[PDB]
Write a protein that holds these residues in place. Structure first.
Motif, PDB file in Angstrom:
ATOM      1  N   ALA A  75       0.733  -1.254   0.086  1.00 54.67           N
ATOM      2  CA  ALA A  75       0.042   0.238  -0.003  1.00 54.67           C
ATOM      3  C   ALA A  75       0.952   1.306   0.049  1.00 54.67           C
ATOM      4  CB  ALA A  75      -0.867   0.219   1.184  1.00 54.67           C
ATOM      5  N   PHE A  76       1.997   1.189   0.822  1.00 56.96           N
ATOM      6  CA  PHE A  76       2.965   2.393   0.841  1.00 56.96           C
ATOM      7  C   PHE A  76       3.452   2.723  -0.623  1.00 56.96           C
ATOM      8  CE2 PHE A  76       6.733   4.541   1.843  1.00 56.96           C
ATOM      9  CZ  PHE A  76       6.571   5.510   2.795  1.00 56.96           C
ATOM     10  N   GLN A  77       3.930   1.438  -1.386  1.00 52.96           N
ATOM     11  CA  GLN A  77       4.477   1.815  -2.557  1.00 52.96           C
ATOM     12  C   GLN A  77       3.346   2.450  -3.553  1.00 52.96           C
ATOM     13  OE1 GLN A  77       6.032  -2.203  -2.996  1.00 52.96           O
ATOM     14  NE2 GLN A  77       7.576  -1.156  -3.787  1.00 52.96           N
ATOM     15  N   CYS A  78       2.234   1.911  -3.535  1.00 46.87           N
ATOM     16  CA  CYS A  78       1.012   2.703  -4.320  1.00 46.87           C
ATOM     17  C   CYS A  78       0.810   4.073  -4.108  1.00 46.87           C
ATOM     18  CB  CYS A  78       0.004   1.768  -4.436  1.00 46.87           C
ATOM     19  SG  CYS A  78       0.144   0.169  -4.757  1.00 46.87           S
ATOM     20  N   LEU A  79       0.647   4.274  -2.726  1.00 44.70           N
ATOM     21  CA  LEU A  79       0.456   5.808  -2.341  1.00 44.70           C
ATOM     22  C   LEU A  79       1.587   6.622  -2.826  1.00 44.70           C
ATOM     23  CD1 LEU A  79      -1.314   7.757  -0.867  1.00 44.70           C
ATOM     24  CD2 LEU A  79      -0.053   7.183   1.142  1.00 44.70           C
ATOM     25  N   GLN A  80       2.816   5.876  -2.504  1.00 46.88           N
ATOM     26  CA  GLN A  80       3.873   6.814  -2.980  1.00 46.88           C
ATOM     27  C   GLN A  80       4.030   7.061  -4.458  1.00 46.88           C
ATOM     28  OE1 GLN A  80       8.242   6.773  -0.767  1.00 46.88           O
ATOM     29  NE2 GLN A  80       7.800   4.835  -1.948  1.00 46.88           N
TER      30      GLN A  80
END
Length: 54
Positions: free
Chosen positions: A3-8
């Motif tokens: 989820a972090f990478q997608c938000l990033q």
DNA sequence: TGAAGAGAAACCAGAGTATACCAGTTACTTCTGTAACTCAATTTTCGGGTCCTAGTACACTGATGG
């Protein structure tokens, strides 16, 4: 993906992240802030930003 | 008068014989700990620096493009 990478990636390719257009109220805010946190010719903009929204 | 052995001068391996190492163990010592004061030598360890290479923030510059 995380989820972090997608938000990033979304942020790093967002366009509503910053405001990209100045308003008179925002100019008054910026002026009042600069006059408060100057020490001379030293205007720390990284300290100023954290009161300007977006 | 040869025949079946009788004697004789060579080799040839092997069994005691001769070495040849190769372990197999009895005393007979030092060296521990603890204690202590001494002093110097030496080590350890220990908190902090120290230098260095490599990014990092950040304000500004310098175009740049629509």
């Amino acid at each position: 993906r995380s989820a972090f990478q997608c938000l990033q990636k979304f942020q790093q390719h967002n366009k509503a992240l910053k405001r990209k257009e100045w308003t008179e109220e925002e100019d008054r805010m910026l002026t009042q802030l600069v006059q408060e946190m100057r020490v001379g010719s030293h205007i720390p903009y990284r300290r100023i930003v954290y009161y300007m929204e977006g």
